[PDB]
Structures are given as C-alpha cells and as structure tokens.
Design a protein around this ligand. Structure first.
Ligand SMILES: [Zn+2]
Ligand SMILES: [Zn+2]
Lengths: 96, 128, 209, 116, 167, 40, 144, 179, 119
DNA sequence: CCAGCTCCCTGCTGGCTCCGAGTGGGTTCTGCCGCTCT
RNA sequence: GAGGGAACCCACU
DNA sequence: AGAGCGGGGAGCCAGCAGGGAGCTGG
C-alpha cells in the first residue's frame, strides 16, 4: 500500500493514497506520449531524407539519385512487399 | 494480540490505555500502581495527585522521570522534592512565555512605527 | 607465461595460414589443421626461453597458379616496429626477390614505419597486422559472409552485364578487416555471397575504395 | 585505525608528516612557521574501503522523538529494559546493499541504539 | 488578492525606501529623498481633466486600464557653500499609475455587498484576482522558482564536479 | 541486463553512436566450458 | 584479471530459443541445447573473441561501431539488420524484411557506416538542393 | 584551526578531516587575508591594475554580493563564515553519503512568485529607472543652469506604461528587452 | 504537460512575514547567537535557521519546537503561515516566514484524538 | 661515444547545428518623445 | 468582386 | 507657435596543446 500497489478495483473505488499513486502512474504515460512525439517525428524525417530518392529502376535494380546500386534486386528477391505471405518450409524441420 | 496476560498485566494494560478514566484510586498502593503511572504525562499526574492526595509522597521519584525529560538541564536544590520543583519551573516557564508574548506584541505593534501606503483621495490634476 | 604465449603463437600461425590458403597461396592441408601439440613438437614450448622463436616462425608461401609468386609472413620479436626492422625485412625480400609480405606485430608500428610501408607499396606490398587482430579468423564469424576476390575479367563481365561504372557499385574500404584479410588493393571488386531471408541467397559486389 | 589532523600551536595551522634521518623517526612539522613535533602514531594515511560495516555511531538518540518513525514494543532495550523502541533502515549511501534495521530506545535519558 | 495587497501596502513603500537618495553635485549639492507613497482609488481623467471614480465595467467597455494613481512625498535638500540646508517638501507627487487587481483592497468593488455589485453591473460570483489592462482582463500566472537562502546539494552528472552545494 | 530498446535504441542505431547507452556482448562458450557453470 | 573495458559480466542459462545453440542431430532434428552464455556491460569484442574457450563464431556485440571496426562492412550490415529487427520485434511488431534490408544497405553502401544524420546524409555525392532540403540549407548552398 | 572550526563541528570525525585535507593542501601558499583578497580580485569581472583596487573589489564581492541574506552590513563576517562553513559541511555530508542529496522536484524547495513578488520586481526595476531619469534631468539643470523643477523631472510614463506593457503583453521585463 | 499546474482547493500560498518577532523571541528563549559561541558547542546543539539564516544554536530543541508550535497554534508572536521544521536526524530547526510557500490546513491531533470537538 | 631538434598520434576545448505534423482563437506592438528653428 | 507583418499566449487532433 | 523629420541538451566537427619516434650532426 505504501509503495503504490492499488489493491482496489475501479468498481470498488480507490483509496486517496491509491488515487494519488494512480495519478502518478498515469502522468508517466501522458509525459511519454508528449515527449516521444518530437523525437519520433525527427527520426521519421531523417529516415525519409536519407532514402527518398532510392527507387526500383527499369533494370529491376535499386538505385539512389546518384545512380549508385543499393540493391541488385529489391529485397534481394525483386518482389513487392504487398503480395508476399507467411508460409512454411516443409523440408526444413522434419528428421531424415 | 498474540500474548498471554495475567491479572496484573491485564488490568494495567487496560488502565495503561485509559489513564484518563482514573478519578479516585480508592486505596490502591503505589507499588501496585507503579506501571500505569510511569507511562503517563505530568498534567495527568497532577490530576491524579489532586484527587488522590495520599499518593503524593510516593510519586515524587516518578516526577524525576518527567523532570529530566522536560527540564533536562536542571537539578533539584536541597529541600526540593521533584513535584514542587516541576511545578515551580513549569509555572515560571509559562509566566516567562506570557511576559514574552506581552512584550513582543506590545513592543512590536504599539511601540515602534512601520511604514505603509495610505489612501490619498486627492484626485490631483497632476495627471490631466 | 610460456604456455599462453605458445598458444598465442599457434593461434597466430593457424590464422595466418588459413589467410594464406584463402588468398590463393599453396598451403598444404597438413599445415592448416596443425594442432597445438604438433606446433609444440615442431617449434618449441618456451618462447621466453626461445625454443619457439618468432624469427624461426617466418612463413614462406607460394601462390597456386604462379609458383614464383611468393609471399612472406614475418614475426618481429620487438613489440613495436621501426624503420630498421622494415629495412631488414625488405632487404630479405629483395635478396629473395619477393614483393609481398605480412608483418605480424605485437603492439603496433610507428607512424614513420607505416609511412615507409605506403611509400614502398609501389614496389613491395607490406601488410600491417596486429597479433590481437590475428588471434582469431574473422571470416569464420557468423556475421561475416563469404567474400571472393574477383578477377579483372569477372569485373568487366559484371560491369558489362549490369551496364555499370565502377563508382556505381557498393563500396568497401581498403582498411576493412575482411579487405585487410584478403589483401585487396583499391580498384578490386569483392563478390559477397550471403544467405537471404527472402531469396535464400544474395550476391553483392563491393568495389575497394 | 583512522588518523586525524594534528595542529600547530604557534599559528594553529596544519602539521604535515616528515622524517628525521638523524634521529631516524617520524615527526609532524608545521611549514608555515618553524614548529616541529615528534609524531605519536606511525600511521600517516589509511584507506577504509570496506570499513563501512558500522552505522550505529552516526545514529543520534533524538530520532526517538520522530513521530514519523515506526515504533515497536517487541524489541526491548538491552541497556535499560524499556519495552518501546523506534526502528529504521540506514539512511546512508552505503545502505543500498542492506535493508538492515537499527533500533533506538524511546525512553528518555537512555538513548541506547542497537541492531536486530 | 493577498499577494497584491501585500505588494501595494508593503512592497511599493519598501521599494521606495530601499532606493538610495539622489546626491547631485556639478558647487551646489542637491539631495532628493523619496519618503512616503500615497495610492488613490482607481480614477479616470478624460480630456477635460475632471477626475471620476472609474468602475471596472467602464474600464472593460471603454478599453481603459483599471489603475490607481501613485503619489509620493519627496524632500529636496539644498547644500550650498556658506549656506544652511534648504528643505523643499514636495508632498504627494504623482509618479505613475499602478494597475489594480479586481476585488483587492484598493479596488472600488472592495467591501461591497452583492446588491451593490449588481447595481454596478458586476457579478457577485466573479472572484476578482485579475487586472484590466486596455479593457482586457489579465491574470498573473504564479511562477515556480527554487527557494532562496537554502543550501541544496546536488550531484552534477558528466561534469568535473562530484557534488555541488548551491545557495 | 539493462539493455536499452525502443526509440532511444532506434536513435542509437540510425545515428551511428560511438557512445551507446548500454553497450554489451553476448559471449558464447566452446565445448565443456558451455556445459558446466564452474568453468563458465 | 579480465579485460579493461568490461565492467560487469552476467552469466545466465537461457530458457528460450532466441539465444540457444541449435544443432542438427544424427537423426536430423533441430535440437536446442541450453548452454551458459555471458553478457557484458562494456564492449571489448576483439579481446573477448581472442579469449580461450570463447566461441569465435557466434560471439557478437550490440555495438555497431566496434562490429564495423572488428569484422567489417558486411558484418556490420548484418549486425545492423539484427539490432533493427530486435528493436522492431520487441513489441511483437512485424515489418517486412525488404525495408530493414534497404535501410541497412543504404547505411552501408559506401564502405563505412553512414549515419542517418546530416553528418552521414549531407556528405554523400547528392546534389546541393537535396542536401539543403534536408538540413544546413545556407551552409550547403555556400559550400556549393 | 579556525577555518576547520567553521567547517567541521565535531573534530573527532576523521573522514571530514580527510576530505578537507586536499583544500588545505591546495590553499597553503596563501596565508594572509590580503593575499587571499588579492587572489579573489585577480579573477574578478574587470581585474584592476592597482592591488588596492583589487582589494576593494574583492571586499565588495565578499560583503555585498557573497551571501546577502546572512549579512550585507560591515563587520557581519562571522555569520557569513559560519554559513559558508555550513555549506562546506553539507557538501562533505553529501560526499560521505551521510546526508541525502537534495531534490529539485521536491516542492518544499520551491517558492511561488504570485502577483505580489512579480509586480514588486517590476516596480523595483522601474523605480530605479525613474530615479535614473530624474538624476539625468536634475544633473542637466544643475550643470549648465542652477535649478530644476522636480515635477517636470519625473516621467510618470516610465512606471505607468511599463506596468501597463508588462501586464498587457505578458513579457515580464522591459519593452526593449522582450526577447 | 506537468509544467502547468493548478492549486488544490484548500492550498494557500504564503504571503510573507517579517522574521523580527521570531528572532527576538529566539534571542530571549535560551538560543545563543553565533557570534557569542565557541565552535565546540555546535557539535551537540541544534542549528537554528530563520529564513535560511543560521542565527544560533539551541541545546533543548524538543521543548523549543513545542513552544514554537504552541505560539503558532494560539496565533501569538508566530503568525499562522510561518513554517517550522525540525530536521531531527540532522539537528536543525528551520523557520521560514518568506512568501511563496504553499501550505494547506490540517486538523491537529494530540494523543490519537482530534482537537476538533463537537463544540 | 651521444646531445640535438622536427613531424605525426591522441586528447581537450570550443564552435555549431538539430530538436513531430497540422489546425483553431486571442492580444499587443510596429511607428517616439527630447527637439532646433520662426 | 479583394491591402500589413511580427511576437507571445491559450486551445485542438 | 507649430508642422514635419533625423536618430535547455545532445552529439558532430575542427583547432590547439602535449606527447613520442627518428633523421642529421658532432
Ligand atoms: Zn605553525
Ligand atoms: Zn533503553
């Protein structure tokens, strides 16, 4: 009870110490959202500006704006990611 | 309370919770009443001793436990039992406190002068 | 201690000769898998006493296609390396008309000595290796995929197939640990074979810059 | 054991350790004035790296008057037999490795402090 | 309201006192000493110049600043060569206007009953605690700060100091 | 182990940090050294 | 004794298959072997790899820079992919492999670790207008 | 001995002696009050070329500007010395781990400037400005002239428009220093 | 979030007071000044701070705090908004009269009984 | 014999640039009060 | 058939 | 007199001092 274990439910209602400790807990989540938005947005911007001109060319290679080869095939298999599915290899796991 | 208590201990723990209930002890010797009076505070001892006067000459050593707790810098002089010393110093300290209150209220409010803003009612044309 | 230093010398020799076999030099299968006991028998047990002496540990190998193309592996006794030891080694190389050598140093080389190496690099190719770096084979690590040094005809066929210039390939530094392992100079291309989560196998090509 | 500061008497400054090879012994000399004094203890400096096992000597008896401290009547005082005593954990930075309880007798004029 | 009343009654006069007297020499010596402040009730002066008791709704509607004139008593002493000190008592000298917090001690709504507030077109439920500056209601947000005159010891991280005490 | 994950670790990855918050190794042992706790 | 950069070593025996020693038996099944593995609080990867009875194959760091300086550019590409996958899939979230592979290939295409920062991106051979669009616009255009 | 009596109150405590040993060893080369004041004045805002000017500057810093709350008047240096020794003692207590470090977010270590203190800070600055402008006006009319009118000397616009500006905009300071 | 806060309903921010009555009372309630004491008496005594100013030491801090609380509770020399803290472990008594201290009213409990009665 | 002096490695300190996206609404201030001259 | 900017504050997802 | 106008952190980089080999000179 002293160190923040709330033994009540939301139906039962919190004791005043439990109410204050629960407010201390929820303020952490509010702070985490508010201070994570800016760093996440900066990460997204830096990720975009590092790769924005990287693209699949007509010889099926992946090149940047300098026409340097990044990947010889996209994803090393040359396939778009919106049509591949989770499948199982039948011969990998079973014994001889 | 996972404790066993005999009749002495039962009576003195109940009475050690409600010292305030004692008006008149009847005829109990102090040697029996020794525990409940040691866990006590001097105003209650004054109440007990002024309802149960026959205990007075027995309880004086008890007052020492109070004196070295409230007047730890002091010692009795000769012809001074601890009860009368505790009452004399207690009333002397209360009188010193009352004199100090009547000084630092009179000599701080009435005697000296403090400066603050006064209302004007001028309506001056200095701002026209 | 003599035992731990003998273990160090055996590990250095094993990694050196794995490197020489990976570089295409003729190193027989008997001396790839040389055990610690066989190294103790052939060389010695107490390097501080001097039964395995580092000067006696010098390895001379010849390349598979060209038997006259030989390379040395030198083991200086002193922890650092100065200009004097470099001059002695290149004099030995000149009197044995050999243009390639590896120098397995203990602590390092002086900056003047590295300057001498890069100055004499047009004539004699001398590679700096720390003993700490050579205590394991980094190409046997699970993070390191397979590197194959490409011949010039393979490079021209690669650039003709993908219609590329050399600067359009991915790059690898000449100071890269695998690049230093394979002893590749600027302008060469390394074919990297690695497993793929999506395709199974993927081949990358990296120009040395 | 620890070594303390020994002070000069002419200027009440700090005495620094020094040796005399003519007598070949150890002396605390003042180097503001010209005072010298033969040193009683040979120990000049001591580390106490793992000598933080004691915390009882830093505890004062006044914490018996703290109303926010936990009180118990199951740990009687050894020095005076009083039934009640406050208990608390150590408040030092050395208390990260120990939740050890220390006890102080709440009887006035006693102030006896012990452990478990 | 309590902070504004303490500011008006005590802090303005104390600020005037702690300001040093002005000693000026070219020679004649002039000593100016500001002695006693006087604060009026919030009054409005129009272009005619006749003072009027300025009401909070008048300040809000006419975009006035609900401020009270602040007068001060000044003493100017003249110290010449071969001449005694000369005293000039410039009593109640106007030195500016202090904006007044609503429903404070020096506001005109102070001590008024709810009926008097309704007759002045003021809401009796309105708390006060704000100023009227150019007809706009302005509240002073309380500002946190470290406590003064107290020793605080911290451990500065990634610095040359293991610990630091600050007062 | 106090290994950092989430957004700070993503920042430590895409920004090539010479001073990671919680640098660590995963050391694997060879032979009998991996099988008993005393030689580990 | 020990290695200077390593402050603490945490032994543990893993109960999950993420850090076990999977082997192929004589019958041919994948068998997980519980073997004792160590963690460090500092990075001295090359000395640890050189040590006796330490696996010189599977032992790895989480430090990108030392993996690059010890094992090379393709190894740090794979390590970058593994660490990004760990960050993504801690939550059980799944991102398709080609996006992680493209990010790591972008960061490792030029032979060194190109950070996703102005000091990595704005030092390439890209045009001045792209660089000034990202960051340090005036400085990039003055350099141009 | 006097410095350590001001710093260390129980001389039977050896670890406080051990930690004050490096400071005594560092500052042994100065042994006089005037040499120490010279050392202080050598690192001032503008070090004076005259040593006596440095002595005056160091004395002004140590009296007027060093711990104004314990004492600012003359010959109130023993209270300041006990307070500085208490600060050093608190630092040693934190160094020993014998006292816990203070908490910035602890809200008993914080005060709330309400309308009173904030308006007092404003009015202090602006009354200083009003006295400055009165000083300039009266200086001008005693320099070339002989007399000055006081009612024309006072610019009420200073106090009035400064309070009005700071309450209207929320920028708590001066109009020319809003940034 | 977290930076802009609001007052609780019964929270009151202190307005400030002059330390002079408390200082005079401490001077003639057996507190000895810092100027008149040898440092050897500081080790066992209680340092007394008034608005953060170390003004003296006291040999009997418990009855001093009892007296100060009795004075504040009956609205004598000490006014109600004055804060008095006894750091018992550190042997200090800190008296704060300055403005900006946020406080709240609490019922006083003496011997597990409220002093608030039905009267 | 052995003292002399120059040029690349490391380390500390200072500068320098970055810090989510998009919406409503408000108020205030720009743009100032001494003039020298007729 | 369309004549200011800037600063700050509050708020929204 | 009065109208109009001049006067916080967090992490990169380079640039300096300190070191420590090593050629020329006696
Ligand atoms: Zn001396
Ligand atoms: Zn006891």
């Amino acid at each position: 009870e002293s160190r923040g274990f709330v033994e009540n439910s939301y139906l039962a209602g919190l004791t005043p110490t439990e109410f204050f400790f629960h407010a201390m807990g929820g303020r952490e989540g509010l702070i985490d959202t508010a201070v994570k938005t800016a760093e996440t947005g900066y990460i997204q911007r830096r990720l975009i500006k590092s790769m924005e001109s990287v693209m699949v060319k007509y010889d099926a290679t992946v090149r940047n704006s300098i026409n340097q080869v990044v990947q010889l095939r996209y994803g090393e298999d040359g396939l778009a990611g919106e049509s591949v599915e989770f499948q199982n290899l039948a011969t990998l796991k079973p014994s001889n | 309370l996972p404790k066993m208590m005999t009749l002495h201990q039962q009576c003195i723990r109940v009475l050690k919770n409600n010292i305030d209930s004692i008006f008149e002890v009847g005829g109990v010797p102090y040697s029996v009443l020794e525990p409940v009076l040691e866990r006590c505070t001097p105003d209650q001892l004054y109440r007990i001793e002024e309802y149960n006067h026959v205990l007075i000459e027995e309880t004086d050593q008890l007052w020492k436990v109070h004196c070295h707790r409230d007047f730890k810098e002091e010692r009795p002089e000769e012809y001074e039992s601890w009860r009368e010393m505790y009452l004399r110093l207690q009333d002397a300290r209360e009188q010193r406190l009352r004199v100090l209150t009547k000084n630092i209220q009179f000599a701080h409010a009435n005697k000296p002068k403090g400066r603050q803003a006064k209302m004007a009612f001028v309506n001056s044309v200095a701002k026209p | 201690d003599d035992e731990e230093e003998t273990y160090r010398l055996w590990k250095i020799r094993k990694t050196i000769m794995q490197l020489c076999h990976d570089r295409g030099y003729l190193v027989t299968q008997d001396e790839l898998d040389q055990t610690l006991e066989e190294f103790k028998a052939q060389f010695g047990d107490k390097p501080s006493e001097g039964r395995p002496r580092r000067t006696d540990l010098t390895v001379l190998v010849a390349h598979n296609d060209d038997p006259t193309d030989q390379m040395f592996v030198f083991f200086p006794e002193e922890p650092k390396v100065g200009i004097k030891t470099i001059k002695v080694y290149c004099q030995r190389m000149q009197e044995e008309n050999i243009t390639r050598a590896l120098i397995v140093v203990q602590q390092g080389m002086t900056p003047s000595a590295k300057q001498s190496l890069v100055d004499m690099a047009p004539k004699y190719i001398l590679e700096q290796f720390l003993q700490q770096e050579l205590l394991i084979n980094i190409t046997e690590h699970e993070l390191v995929p397979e590197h194959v040094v490409m011949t010039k005809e393979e490079v021209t066929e690669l650039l003709a197939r993908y219609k590329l210039r050399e600067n359009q390939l991915p790059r690898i530094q000449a100071g890269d640990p695998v690049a230093r392992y394979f002893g590749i100079k600027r302008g060469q291309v390394v074919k990297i074979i690695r497993p793929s989560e999506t395709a199974g196998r993927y081949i990358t090509y990296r120009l040395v810059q | 054991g620890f070594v303390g500061i020994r002070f000069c008497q002419e200027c009440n400054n700090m005495l620094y350790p020094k040796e005399d090879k003519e007598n070949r012994i150890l002396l605390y000399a003042c180097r503001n004035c010209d005072y010298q004094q033969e040193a009683d203890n040979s120990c000049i400096y001591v580390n106490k790296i793992t000598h933080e096992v004691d915390e009882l000597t830093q505890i004062i008896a006044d914490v018996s008057q703290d109303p926010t401290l936990p009180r118990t009547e199951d740990h009687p005082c050894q020095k005076c037999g009083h039934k009640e005593a406050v208990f608390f954990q150590s408040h030092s930075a050395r208390a990260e490795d120990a939740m050890r309880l220390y006890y102080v007798c709440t009887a006035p004029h006693c102030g006896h402090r012990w452990t478990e | 309201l309590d902070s504004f009343d303490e500011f008006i009654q005590m802090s303005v006069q104390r600020i005037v006192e702690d300001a040093p007297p002005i000693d000026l020499q070219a020679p004649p010596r002039y000593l100016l000493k500001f002695e006693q402040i006087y604060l009026s009730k919030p009054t409005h002066w129009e272009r005619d110049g006749a003072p009027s008791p300025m009401m909070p709704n008048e300040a809000r509607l006419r975009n006035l600043t609900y401020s009270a004139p602040l007068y001060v008593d000044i003493t100017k002493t003249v110290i010449k060569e071969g001449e005694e000190q000369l005293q000039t008592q410039h009593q109640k000298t106007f030195i500016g206007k202090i904006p007044i917090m609503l429903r404070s001690t020096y506001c005109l709504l102070n001590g008024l009953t709810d009926r008097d507030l309704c007759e002045l077109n003021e809401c009796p439920l309105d708390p006060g605690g704000y100023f009227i500056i150019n007809g706009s209601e302005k509240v002073l947000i309380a500002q946190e700060k470290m406590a003064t005159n107290t020793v605080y010891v911290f451990a500065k991280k990634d610095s040359k100091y293991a610990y630091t005490g600050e007062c | 182990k106090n290994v950092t994950l989430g957004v700070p670790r993503l920042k430590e990855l895409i920004n090539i940090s010479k001073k990671p918050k919680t640098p660590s190794l995963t050391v694997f042992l060879l032979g009998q050294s991996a099988r008993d706790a005393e030689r580990a | 004794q020990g290695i200077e950069q390593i402050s603490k070593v945490y032994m543990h025996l893993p109960q999950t298959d993420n850090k076990k020693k999977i082997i192929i038996t004589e019958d041919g099944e994948f068998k997980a072997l519980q073997e004792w593995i160590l963690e460090t609080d500092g990075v001295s990867l090359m000395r640890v790899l050189s040590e006796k009875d330490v696996d010189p194959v599977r032992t790895t760091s989480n430090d990108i820079v030392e993996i690059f300086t010890v094992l090379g550019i393709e190894a740090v590409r794979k390590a970058l992919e593994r660490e990004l996958y760990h960050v993504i899939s801690f939550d059980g979230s799944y991102v398709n492999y080609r996006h992680l592979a493209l990010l790591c290939d972008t960061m490792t295409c030029r032979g060194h670790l190109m950070a996703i920062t102005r000091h990595g991106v704005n030092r390439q051979d890209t045009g001045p207008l792209m660089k000034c669009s990202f960051e340090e616009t005036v400085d990039v255009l003055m350099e141009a | 001995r006097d410095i350590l009596e001001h710093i260390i109150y129980d001389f039977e405590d050896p670890e406080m002696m051990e930690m004050v040993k490096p400071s005594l060893d560092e500052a042994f080369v100065i042994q006089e009050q005037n040499v120490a004041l010279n050392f202080i004045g050598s690192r001032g805002a503008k070090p004076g070329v005259t040593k006596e000017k440095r002595i005056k500057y160091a004395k002004e810093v140590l009296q007027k500007e060093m711990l104004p709350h314990v004492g600012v008047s003359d010959f109130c240096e023993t209270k300041k010395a006990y307070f500085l020794g208490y600060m050093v003692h608190r630092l040693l207590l934190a160094a020993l781990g014998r006292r816990e470090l203070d908490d910035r977010d602890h809200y008993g270590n914080k005060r709330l400037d309400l309308a009173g203190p904030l308006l007092a800070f404003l009015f202090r600055g602006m009354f200083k400005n009003l006295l400055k402008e009165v000083r300039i006006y009266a200086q001008k009319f005693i320099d070339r002239g002989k007399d000055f009118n006081l009612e024309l000397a006072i610019k009420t616009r200073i106090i009035s428009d400064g309070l009005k500006y700071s309450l209207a905009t929320g920028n708590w300071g001066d109009q020319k220093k809003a940034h | 979030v977290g930076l802009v806060k609001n007052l609780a309903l019964m929270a009151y921010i202190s307005v400030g007071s002059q330390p002079s009555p408390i200082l005079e009372f401490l001077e003639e309630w057996s507190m000895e000044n810092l100027e008149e004491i040898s440092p050897a008496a500081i080790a066992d005594a209680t340092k007394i701070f008034v608005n953060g100013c170390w003004v003296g030491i006291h040999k009997d801090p418990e009855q001093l705090m009892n007296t100060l609380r009795k004075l504040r509770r009956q609205m004598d020399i000490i006014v109600s908004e004055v804060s008095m803290i006894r750091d018992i472990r550190e042997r200090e008594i800190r008296i704060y009269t300055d403005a900006g201290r946020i406080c709240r009213p609490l019922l006083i409990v003496e011997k597990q009984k409220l002093l608030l009665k039905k009267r």
